[PDB]
Amino acid sequence: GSDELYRQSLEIISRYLREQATGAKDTKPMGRSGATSRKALETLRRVGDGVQRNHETAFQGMLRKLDIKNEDDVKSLSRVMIHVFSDGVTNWGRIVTLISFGAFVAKHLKTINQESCIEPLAESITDVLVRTKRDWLVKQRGWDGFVEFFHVED
Amino acid sequence: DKTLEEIARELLKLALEIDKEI
Ligand SMILES: [Cl-]
């Protein structure tokens, strides 16, 4: 298919945000490169939740000021999202920061019966990530590099 | 003085904190 990087990225980010909001792992089969995407999801469960615990106050402080309740507000977040790159630095930390921000928003949407807004939220996040940093992601081997970046000694 | 602009700066600040971890 056309633009496989975007499709895969949306698949990963969609399922993570929805799983974070509902607390239930998805079981619907994934598509091309889904095996790598499964490992990236598990990586996000570990790393993403670690970021959320250590910085929940900062993230909650943002939600308080944002006061988003509908689809329009969700899309309006793109202006905020791009600031993870504001200093000219790009790394998997900034991307995990952005996705973790999405997780806090997705959890909120759940609590006000806006699960339908999680899908356009994931599209907005994937837009900021892929539409502005595609060159960086390709050079970093995409989600396979993501998985290898967070490899734990175990 | 916009809340959205203020939040954007906080998001950058938070990202720089997270660089120290991952
Ligand atoms: Cl790095």
Would you kindly provide a written description of the structure presented here, covering whatever features stand out?
The complex is a heterodimer of chains A (154) and B (22). With 154 residues, chain A is mainly alpha-helical. Chain A has a single domain (1-150), classed as Apoptosis Regulator Bcl-x (Orthogonal Bundle). Chain A has helices at 4-22, 34-54, 56-66, 71-75, 78-81, 92-111, 118-139, 142-149. In chain B, 77% of the residues lie in helices and 0% in strands. Chain B is built from 1 helix and no strands. Chain B has one helix at residues 3-19. The radius of gyration of chain B is 10 Å and the shape is rod-shaped. The chains are: A mainly alpha (154), B mainly alpha (22). The A-B interface holds A 47, 50-51, 54-55, 58-59, 61-62, 65-66, 76, 79-81, 83-84, 86-87, 89, 91-94, 96-97, 101, 150 and B 3-4, 6-19, 21-22. The structure holds chloride ion (CL).
Structural features:
heterodimer, A: 154 residues, mainly alpha, Apoptosis Regulator Bcl-x, 8 helices, 0% strand, globular, B: 22 residues, 77% helix, binds chloride ion, Induced myeloid leukemia cell differentiation protein Mcl-1 (chain A)
General shape of chain A: globular
Counting DSSP E segments of at least 2 residues, the number of strands of chain A comes to 0
H/I helix tally of chain A:
8
Distance between the termini of chain B: 32 Å
Radius of gyration of chain B: 10 Å
The major sheet of chain B is characterized as: none
CATH architecture heading of chain A: Orthogonal Bundle
The global form of chain B is rod-shaped
Number of strands of chain B: 0
CATH names the topology of chain A as Apoptosis Regulator Bcl-x
Number of domains of chain A: 1
Structural class by helix and strand composition of chain B: mainly alpha
Share of helix of chain B, binned: over 70%
Which hetero compounds are present in the coordinates?
A: chloride ion
Largest sheet of chain A: none
Subcellular location (chain A): Membrane; Cytoplasm; Mitochondrion; Nucleus, Nucleoplasm
Motif (BH3) (chain A): 40-54
Motif (BH1) (chain A): 83-103
Motif (BH2) (chain A): 135-150
